[PDB]
């Protein structure tokens, strides 16, 4: 077992033993970027390879070359945490050694001077956190792995809809990793066409001519030969018996004094066998048989010296008699069949406008760049630069591989550019497909689908940077002088900087990590997308690619995918899934040799898995693991059916290996329909953390692996005892077996405290260990938000009853008692970050000064001398968090205000109040205040206060570290001295610092003493720097935007319990909205008088089929039962015996479940604590498909003295009388979505408007009016409410006079409207009349 | 022209200075009051397309 597994244990039902445990869930994200940035000895993908691609860069013929030596990543400017505060990017400097060589003109190549410039900084690049996240501006962000069509050759069909004929079509497409696409396609006339990209269509052969192929050669490529012999007189023919197949005899087939075939007699296998064994190498044919046959090569008269017939031309009884008299004996003709071997290329030539290489190149250049005059150098350079350029083209490794593999080649690796043989082979294959041999692959198949990740894309971006800078290098090297410049003046910063900064900054893939929740983060980091650059779009792709493919098994989750605009264009990574070496997806399997199912794991990709017969995770094997039944359910090639006892090569690794980490957290999933299951696994990521993280009452067993593998918790790096435990920090003393010889050391984990998340929720760690407690290597030291003892708790369980309660639960709406809002269990904490901008206008600078025109003493009280709110001061909507004032000259009043100001003696201030007020309606406590001052502007009072405070706090925080670490080290030295030098009492007497001056007998112990000291001083000096830098980074003015003099960031912590209108659901996809909060008095109770927490609606259950939501209720009930029993025995303090007995009983449950429980545990100090944590309930694990069973749940119920029915009599808290029939009651885990009404509720009367078109628009976060759409208009039309409509689209919105002229009448008590004309139509009048169109309003 | 003159010295100090010369350390290299940087660097930048 383990350590923190002593504090609690989940009861694990199910039979199937885990053959392979769950790996690191964050695997992909980390591994990828781990490959991107790294020093790679070779051209394997990485910054190295990216460099080696475009480099070296030489001037155009100028013999001045710039090559690349090596690169390095300097230490980050700010650490992960500091950078999260300041708001900069967590990034490392890119320092690269470049070399500029100037070749002495007139080769041999040797250089006059090569200046090797030291590392030149181009840009900084983002870094990945241990949690697989990036921080762009003070915010954790994630780059979603992309899934797209892998580079290579692709043979499609496109039948049906095309041309309505039904003759179908066949198209091939060569798609590289970069560069133009090469398409080959047929048409109804069987003419082979080719196009680059999506461009103009061209007859296929025209590419071959550009490759230097004459007609003769093309015909030599795509057609066999039929040899004719004019021997004696009157032509004969060579014959291979297989040729005659698929045809009926055109004449008398006879030779060798024996007539094999007659006319009108089709040639079957019989005639073929006869002619075959008889060995007929020659047959005489009529002079008329060549009337249709097409000549292969050219032909000329030796005498006349004229062209008799061009290559690829139909022979006639005329031309034949023309070339036969010339002496020609042999004539070559294409071997053509309209069934077996199709004459497509021959007919392609007849559509070919071109003749030679040049003409082809011209017709191509006038295709790619149509309309501009074609040139030789142009048409050459283009065609060479398209598919043959090492620069502008590549398939990469995946591309070359899939290419050769789909061409049935041998070599899995080769060049990134096409070869003549490549293109020609692809054409040959397309032809073969049209001929009836060979199949067509499909895009949806996961074997044709690749998966990128952060690293690849980052590499692509940095690459684009390198090319856009390459142009600059070659540009400057044009006119450059000798030693005057260096590889600095050329290479800029921005080209790399903004290039990578763009990607991480704005991309549909790059996005703010969704952090409300551990499962949210972890399921965001494992996510795939067919969208973004390189992929398709929502409107682009249809349902096909969206749909779950059979290949998605063990790779993609069939359930958890977003439901909406993009469905199936995202999905999620399966639990055990891995990115293939090439970047396909591969899944764990169990190799079955002979008749035994072996526990040896194997990784098969989408293509690898294809022919193999795979058994099922749900199957029965006993002892040595032989399949019980002689017939076992298995899926083999694309399909699934019953297979013979031993026909199988493989079996499923686990029960959960089909689903995803999110879908694996749904208990009794096998009992839920896939729709509502999707809804559930989608909503579970929307769970907001709670104030008291509880625990799942009904589990799976992934709840540990999730919270653990995610960064929310803090795991121990090494095992040992805890020296110190604080809500702030945790200090572990490292065990000797683990700990390194030098420096000794004790692991110090600094815990994260209350701080803002990306979702404006609260993220706060808490210590789960006590002072001086033993820990295991890799154990949970401190939990996170919504995490309990290593297990993931996304919400809180509670007492649930199914019964209609006076309609208050009517729809999916939920009715909850007051016991829940009282205990503050469902309460959540929110952290809002508000900012105040001090800018500069031509009218004057803005002041943050506390001196504000027109404010009360109650407003001025909450602020200090500097105008900043005190830390810890609780505020509500309208309070002044930060004072601000902006200069406004010449108030420019009217006589009424002139008289008013004259009488009341009020000087109109030259300044307007710009202060940042608390958003209306929200109320919280100020936790933290930050001040960013422009470099060079004098720091204000509060600024200095904050600065010095941070200085002292940093001094204490670093000093404490130095102290703990040093005491720990000296202790280790003192430990070494007593071995070989021993004086125990006599040692610690003299000053500690003196201990260093001591020696010891000759031994390795004298060396360790050297080490301890050698490292001591390191930590001694490493203090200085760690202080100095830390000091300076507090002092330096943070860089700001143009015009902003300083910025005050205030952090507010609001606490919201729960109220009607909030949305909360279960993991089964049953939504709900709290309707009323009912008194405990009116709450239905049982015979024990215990009120029920929540009353749901039983009507929602049958229609939306999730029966799991009931099972979770039943089991949970029984589960809590086992809690109460223990809670009794603990309250009655029986003994360590009875408790052990009952606990052992509960951990067994009938027969045949893998458990492995106690009596190893210490009889008192251990067991008694386990029961102590179990008194709240008995946590139960129900694996996805391996989960619990009816009778098991019922038996556990019997163990809890609860009924089998799971239904207990209830009583109305009002009349007290019984409810007829029982009601299902129990415990259901309920989350709380972040959809709380406090955010959702909006309203407006008359707000600010828009400048362009006068329309309602929120300026102050005072929400602009609701949108009235065309349909919403049709409603009013149908009703026939005319004035409602008019005012709706005129006076309440678009009418610039109407709005105010209305408002006046509104206050005056007169309800009317003087509508006028909406500004939209007026604007349209001006817009139309701006053109040559005269549009007027007429009549009267 | 006077703007370009700043765009010049901005580059020499780019990677040489680590990140880049501070907003107030340019015009020292120029001959002028050193305040011009703010105003000039402000009014210069072309307006963003209202249709962005």
Coordinates of N, CA and C in Angstrom, one line a residue, chain A residues 473-610:
Chain A
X473 N 18.9 39.1 -44.1 CA 20.3 38.7 -44.2 C 20.8 38.8 -45.6
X474 N 20.2 38.1 -46.5 CA 20.5 38.1 -47.9 C 20.4 39.5 -48.5
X475 N 19.5 40.3 -48.0 CA 19.3 41.7 -48.4 C 20.5 42.6 -48.1
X476 N 20.9 42.5 -46.8 CA 22.1 43.3 -46.4 C 23.4 42.9 -47.0
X477 N 23.6 41.6 -47.1 CA 24.8 41.0 -47.7 C 25.0 41.4 -49.2
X478 N 24.0 42.0 -49.8 CA 24.1 42.5 -51.2 C 25.2 43.6 -51.3
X479 N 25.1 44.6 -50.6 CA 26.0 45.8 -50.7 C 27.1 45.9 -49.6
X480 N 27.1 44.9 -48.7 CA 28.0 44.9 -47.5 C 29.5 45.1 -47.7
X481 N 30.1 45.8 -46.8 CA 31.6 45.9 -46.8 C 32.2 44.8 -46.0
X482 N 33.5 44.8 -45.8 CA 34.3 43.6 -45.3 C 34.1 43.3 -43.9
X483 N 34.9 44.0 -43.0 CA 34.9 43.7 -41.6 C 34.0 44.7 -40.8
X484 N 33.4 45.7 -41.5 CA 32.7 46.8 -40.9 C 31.5 46.3 -40.0
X485 N 30.8 45.3 -40.6 CA 29.6 44.8 -39.9 C 30.0 43.4 -39.3
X486 N 29.0 42.9 -38.5 CA 29.1 41.6 -37.8 C 27.8 41.0 -37.7
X487 N 27.7 39.7 -37.5 CA 26.4 39.0 -37.4 C 25.6 39.5 -36.1
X488 N 25.4 40.8 -36.0 CA 24.6 41.5 -35.0 C 23.8 42.5 -35.8
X489 N 24.4 43.5 -36.4 CA 23.8 44.5 -37.2 C 22.7 44.0 -38.2
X490 N 23.0 42.8 -38.7 CA 22.0 42.1 -39.6 C 20.8 41.6 -38.9
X491 N 21.0 40.6 -38.0 CA 19.9 40.0 -37.3 C 19.3 40.9 -36.2
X492 N 18.0 41.0 -36.4 CA 17.2 41.9 -35.5 C 16.6 41.1 -34.3
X493 N 15.8 41.7 -33.5 CA 15.2 41.1 -32.4 C 13.7 40.7 -32.7
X494 N 12.9 41.7 -33.0 CA 11.5 41.6 -33.4 C 11.1 40.5 -34.3
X495 N 11.9 40.2 -35.4 CA 11.5 39.1 -36.3 C 11.2 37.8 -35.6
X496 N 12.0 37.4 -34.6 CA 11.7 36.2 -33.8 C 10.7 36.5 -32.8
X497 N 10.9 37.6 -32.1 CA 10.1 38.0 -30.9 C 8.6 38.0 -31.2
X498 N 8.2 38.9 -32.1 CA 6.8 39.0 -32.5 C 6.3 37.8 -33.2
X499 N 7.2 37.0 -33.8 CA 6.7 35.8 -34.5 C 6.3 34.7 -33.5
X500 N 7.0 34.5 -32.5 CA 6.6 33.5 -31.5 C 5.6 34.0 -30.6
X501 N 5.7 35.3 -30.3 CA 4.8 36.1 -29.4 C 3.4 36.1 -30.0
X502 N 3.4 36.1 -31.3 CA 2.1 36.1 -32.0 C 1.4 34.8 -31.8
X503 N 2.1 33.7 -32.0 CA 1.5 32.4 -31.8 C 0.9 32.2 -30.4
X504 N 1.8 32.3 -29.4 CA 1.3 32.1 -28.0 C 0.3 33.2 -27.7
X505 N 0.4 34.4 -28.2 CA -0.4 35.5 -28.0 C -1.8 35.4 -28.5
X506 N -1.9 35.2 -29.9 CA -3.2 35.0 -30.5 C -3.2 33.8 -31.5
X507 N -3.9 32.7 -31.1 CA -4.2 31.6 -32.0 C -5.4 30.9 -31.5
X508 N -6.2 30.3 -32.3 CA -7.4 29.6 -31.9 C -7.0 28.4 -31.1
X509 N -5.8 28.0 -31.2 CA -5.3 26.9 -30.4 C -4.8 27.3 -29.0
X510 N -4.1 28.5 -29.0 CA -3.5 29.0 -27.8 C -4.6 29.7 -27.0
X511 N -4.7 29.3 -25.8 CA -5.8 30.0 -25.1 C -5.5 29.9 -23.6
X512 N -6.2 30.8 -22.9 CA -6.2 30.8 -21.5 C -6.6 29.4 -21.0
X513 N -5.8 28.8 -20.2 CA -6.1 27.5 -19.6 C -7.4 27.7 -18.9
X514 N -8.3 26.7 -19.0 CA -9.6 26.9 -18.3 C -9.3 26.3 -16.9
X515 N -9.1 27.3 -16.0 CA -8.8 26.9 -14.6 C -9.9 27.4 -13.8
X516 N -10.9 26.6 -13.6 CA -11.8 26.6 -12.4 C -11.6 25.4 -11.6
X517 N -10.8 24.5 -12.0 CA -10.9 23.1 -11.6 C -9.8 22.2 -12.1
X518 N -9.3 21.3 -11.3 CA -8.2 20.3 -11.7 C -8.6 19.5 -12.9
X519 N -9.8 19.0 -13.0 CA -10.2 18.2 -14.1 C -10.3 19.1 -15.3
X520 N -10.7 20.3 -15.1 CA -10.8 21.3 -16.2 C -9.5 21.5 -16.9
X521 N -8.5 21.8 -16.0 CA -7.1 22.0 -16.5 C -6.6 20.8 -17.2
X522 N -6.7 19.7 -16.5 CA -6.1 18.4 -17.0 C -6.7 17.9 -18.3
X523 N -8.0 18.2 -18.5 CA -8.8 17.8 -19.6 C -8.6 18.8 -20.7
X524 N -8.1 20.0 -20.4 CA -7.8 21.0 -21.4 C -6.5 20.7 -22.0
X525 N -5.5 20.3 -21.2 CA -4.2 20.0 -21.6 C -4.2 18.7 -22.4
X526 N -5.1 17.8 -22.1 CA -5.3 16.6 -23.1 C -6.5 17.0 -23.8
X527 N -6.3 17.5 -25.0 CA -7.4 17.9 -25.9 C -6.8 17.9 -27.3
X528 N -7.6 17.5 -28.3 CA -7.2 17.6 -29.7 C -8.1 18.5 -30.5
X529 N -7.6 19.1 -31.5 CA -8.4 20.0 -32.4 C -8.1 19.8 -33.9
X530 N -9.1 19.7 -34.7 CA -9.0 19.7 -36.1 C -9.1 21.1 -36.7
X531 N -9.2 22.1 -35.8 CA -9.4 23.5 -36.2 C -8.0 24.1 -36.1
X532 N -8.0 25.5 -36.3 CA -6.8 26.3 -36.4 C -6.1 26.2 -37.7
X533 N -4.9 26.9 -37.8 CA -4.2 26.9 -39.1 C -3.7 25.4 -39.4
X534 N -3.9 25.0 -40.7 CA -3.6 23.7 -41.1 C -4.7 22.7 -41.1
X535 N -5.7 23.1 -40.3 CA -6.9 22.3 -40.2 C -8.1 22.9 -40.9
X536 N -9.3 22.2 -40.8 CA -10.5 22.7 -41.5 C -11.2 23.7 -40.5
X537 N -12.4 24.1 -40.9 CA -13.2 25.0 -40.2 C -14.6 24.4 -39.9
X538 N -15.3 25.1 -39.0 CA -16.7 24.6 -38.6 C -17.6 24.5 -39.8
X539 N -17.6 25.5 -40.7 CA -18.4 25.6 -41.8 C -17.8 24.8 -43.0
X540 N -16.5 24.4 -42.9 CA -15.8 23.7 -43.9 C -16.2 22.3 -43.9
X541 N -15.9 21.5 -42.9 CA -16.1 20.1 -42.8 C -17.5 19.8 -42.4
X542 N -18.0 18.7 -43.0 CA -19.4 18.2 -42.7 C -19.4 17.3 -41.5
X543 N -20.4 16.4 -41.4 CA -20.5 15.5 -40.3 C -19.6 14.3 -40.3
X544 N -19.1 13.9 -41.5 CA -18.2 12.7 -41.6 C -17.0 12.7 -40.6
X545 N -16.2 13.7 -40.7 CA -15.0 13.8 -39.9 C -15.3 14.1 -38.4
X546 N -16.5 14.7 -38.2 CA -17.0 14.9 -36.8 C -17.4 13.6 -36.1
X547 N -17.9 12.7 -36.9 CA -18.5 11.4 -36.3 C -17.4 10.6 -35.7
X548 N -17.7 9.8 -34.7 CA -16.8 8.9 -34.1 C -16.5 7.7 -35.1
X549 N -15.2 7.6 -35.3 CA -14.7 6.6 -36.2 C -14.3 5.3 -35.4
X550 N -14.4 4.1 -36.0 CA -14.0 2.9 -35.3 C -12.6 3.0 -34.8
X551 N -11.7 3.8 -35.5 CA -10.3 3.9 -35.1 C -10.2 4.7 -33.8
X552 N -11.2 5.5 -33.4 CA -11.2 6.3 -32.2 C -11.1 5.4 -31.0
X553 N -11.2 4.1 -31.1 CA -11.2 3.2 -30.0 C -9.8 3.3 -29.3
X554 N -9.8 3.5 -28.0 CA -8.6 3.5 -27.3 C -7.7 4.7 -27.5
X555 N -8.2 5.6 -28.4 CA -7.4 6.7 -28.8 C -8.2 8.0 -28.5
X556 N -9.4 8.1 -29.0 CA -10.3 9.2 -28.8 C -11.5 8.8 -27.9
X557 N -11.9 9.7 -27.0 CA -13.1 9.4 -26.2 C -14.4 9.6 -27.0
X558 N -15.2 8.6 -27.2 CA -16.4 8.6 -27.9 C -17.5 9.5 -27.3
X559 N -17.4 9.6 -25.9 CA -18.4 10.5 -25.2 C -17.9 11.9 -25.0
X560 N -16.8 12.2 -24.4 CA -16.5 13.6 -24.1 C -16.0 14.3 -25.3
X561 N -16.8 15.1 -25.8 CA -16.6 16.0 -26.9 C -17.5 17.2 -26.7
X562 N -17.2 18.4 -27.1 CA -18.1 19.5 -27.0 C -19.3 19.4 -27.9
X563 N -20.5 19.7 -27.3 CA -21.7 19.7 -28.1 C -22.1 21.2 -28.4
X564 N -22.1 21.5 -29.7 CA -22.3 22.8 -30.2 C -21.8 23.0 -31.6
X565 N -21.4 24.3 -31.9 CA -20.9 24.7 -33.2 C -19.9 23.8 -33.8
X566 N -18.9 23.4 -33.0 CA -18.0 22.4 -33.3 C -18.1 21.1 -32.5
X567 N -18.6 20.1 -33.1 CA -18.8 18.8 -32.5 C -17.9 17.8 -33.2
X568 N -17.1 16.9 -32.5 CA -16.3 16.0 -33.1 C -15.1 16.6 -33.8
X569 N -15.0 17.9 -33.8 CA -13.8 18.6 -34.3 C -12.8 18.8 -33.2
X570 N -13.1 18.3 -32.0 CA -12.3 18.5 -30.9 C -12.0 17.2 -30.2
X571 N -13.1 16.6 -29.6 CA -13.0 15.5 -28.7 C -12.0 15.6 -27.5
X572 N -11.4 14.5 -27.2 CA -10.4 14.4 -26.1 C -9.5 13.2 -26.2
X573 N -8.3 13.3 -25.6 CA -7.4 12.2 -25.7 C -7.9 11.1 -24.7
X574 N -7.8 9.8 -25.2 CA -8.1 8.7 -24.3 C -7.1 8.6 -23.2
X575 N -7.5 7.9 -22.1 CA -6.7 7.7 -20.9 C -5.3 7.2 -21.2
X576 N -5.3 6.0 -21.8 CA -4.0 5.3 -22.0 C -3.3 5.6 -23.4
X577 N -4.0 6.5 -24.1 CA -3.5 6.9 -25.5 C -2.1 7.5 -25.5
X578 N -1.3 7.3 -26.5 CA 0.0 7.9 -26.7 C 0.2 8.4 -28.1
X579 N 1.0 9.4 -28.2 CA 1.4 9.9 -29.5 C 2.4 9.0 -30.1
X580 N 2.1 8.5 -31.3 CA 3.0 7.5 -32.0 C 4.4 8.2 -32.3
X581 N 5.4 7.4 -32.5 CA 6.7 7.9 -32.8 C 6.7 8.9 -34.0
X582 N 5.8 8.6 -35.0 CA 5.6 9.4 -36.1 C 4.6 10.5 -35.9
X583 N 3.8 10.3 -34.8 CA 2.7 11.3 -34.5 C 1.3 10.8 -34.9
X584 N 1.1 9.5 -35.1 CA -0.2 8.9 -35.2 C -0.6 8.7 -33.7
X585 N -1.8 8.0 -33.5 CA -2.2 7.7 -32.1 C -2.1 6.2 -31.9
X586 N -1.5 5.8 -30.8 CA -1.4 4.4 -30.5 C -1.9 4.0 -29.1
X587 N -2.4 2.8 -28.9 CA -3.1 2.4 -27.7 C -2.6 1.1 -27.1
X588 N -2.6 1.0 -25.8 CA -2.1 -0.3 -25.1 C -3.0 -1.5 -25.4
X589 N -2.3 -2.6 -25.6 CA -3.0 -3.9 -25.8 C -2.2 -5.0 -25.1
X590 N -2.8 -6.2 -25.0 CA -2.1 -7.3 -24.4 C -1.9 -8.4 -25.4
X591 N -0.6 -8.7 -25.6 CA -0.2 -9.7 -26.6 C -0.7 -11.1 -26.1
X592 N -1.4 -11.8 -27.0 CA -1.8 -13.2 -26.7 C -1.0 -14.2 -27.6
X593 N -0.1 -14.9 -27.0 CA 0.7 -15.9 -27.7 C 0.0 -17.3 -27.4
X594 N 0.1 -18.2 -28.4 CA -0.5 -19.5 -28.2 C -2.0 -19.4 -27.6
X595 N -2.2 -20.2 -26.5 CA -3.5 -20.2 -25.9 C -3.6 -19.4 -24.6
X596 N -2.6 -18.7 -24.3 CA -2.5 -18.0 -23.0 C -2.6 -16.5 -23.2
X597 N -3.3 -15.8 -22.4 CA -3.4 -14.3 -22.5 C -2.3 -13.7 -21.6
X598 N -1.3 -13.2 -22.3 CA -0.1 -12.7 -21.6 C -0.3 -11.3 -21.1
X599 N 0.5 -10.9 -20.0 CA 0.4 -9.6 -19.4 C 1.3 -8.6 -20.1
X600 N 2.0 -9.1 -21.1 CA 2.9 -8.2 -21.8 C 2.2 -7.1 -22.6
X601 N 2.5 -5.9 -22.3 CA 1.8 -4.7 -23.0 C 2.4 -4.6 -24.4
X602 N 1.6 -3.9 -25.3 CA 2.1 -3.6 -26.7 C 1.4 -2.4 -27.2
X603 N 2.2 -1.5 -27.9 CA 1.6 -0.3 -28.4 C 1.4 -0.4 -29.9
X604 N 0.1 -0.4 -30.3 CA -0.3 -0.5 -31.7 C -0.9 0.8 -32.2
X605 N -0.6 1.3 -33.4 CA -1.1 2.5 -34.0 C -2.4 2.1 -34.7
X606 N -3.0 3.1 -35.3 CA -4.3 2.9 -36.0 C -4.1 1.9 -37.2
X607 N -3.1 2.1 -37.9 CA -2.8 1.1 -39.0 C -2.3 -0.2 -38.5
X608 N -1.5 -0.2 -37.5 CA -0.9 -1.5 -36.9 C -2.1 -2.4 -36.4
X609 N -3.1 -1.8 -35.8 CA -4.1 -2.5 -35.1 C -5.1 -3.2 -36.1
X610 N -4.9 -2.9 -37.4 CA -5.9 -3.2 -38.4 C -6.3 -4.7 -38.6

